[PDB]
Design a protein around this ligand. Structure first.
Ligand SMILES: *[Se]c1ccccc1C(=O)Nc1ccccc1OC
Length: 124
């Protein structure tokens, strides 16, 4: 198993730029991994988003400097209209992504247990 709870990963979800996030357990399947292999991630930032991500869309987070290669490869690897599916980041989205980056670098400087304490979403 490539990742475990509290791992920081870049996650690619169709329709969004490559986004900092954390491996975490799904609130109602109480699992962080499964075979549909997928992993469950919380996306960092002010929106409390979460998703199941195929491992091929998951890259271990080292830091913001990985963003350019991720973005450029993903549009490089596209089978023309597929390459076009690579759209701009508005000012509002960029600030939301910059927020998520700031959380992810904080999280990366604590331990897995401190960042699990600080960043795990609270559910009903
Ligand atoms: Se990853 C990146 C870097 C710089 C500009 C745009 C992107 C990007 O991937 N944008 C994408 C890709 C797919 C859907 C939407 C969207 O931008 C919102």
């Amino acid at each position: 198993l490539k990742y475990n709870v509290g791992d920081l990963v870049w996650s690619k979800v169709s329709g969004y730029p490559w986004w900092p996030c954390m491996v975490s357990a799904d609130p109602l399947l109480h699992s962080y991994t499964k075979l549909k292999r997928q992993y469950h991630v919380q996306f960092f930032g002010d929106a409390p988003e979460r998703a199941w991500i195929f491992e091929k869309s998951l890259v271990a987070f080292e830091g913001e400097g990985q963003f350019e290669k991720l973005c450029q490869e993903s549009a490089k690897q596209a089978p023309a209209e597929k390459i076009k599916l690579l759209k701009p980041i508005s000012g509002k989205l960029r600030a939301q992504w910059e927020m998520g980056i700031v959380q992810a670098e904080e999280a990366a400087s604590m331990s897995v247990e401190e960042r699990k304490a600080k960043f795990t979403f609270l559910y009903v």
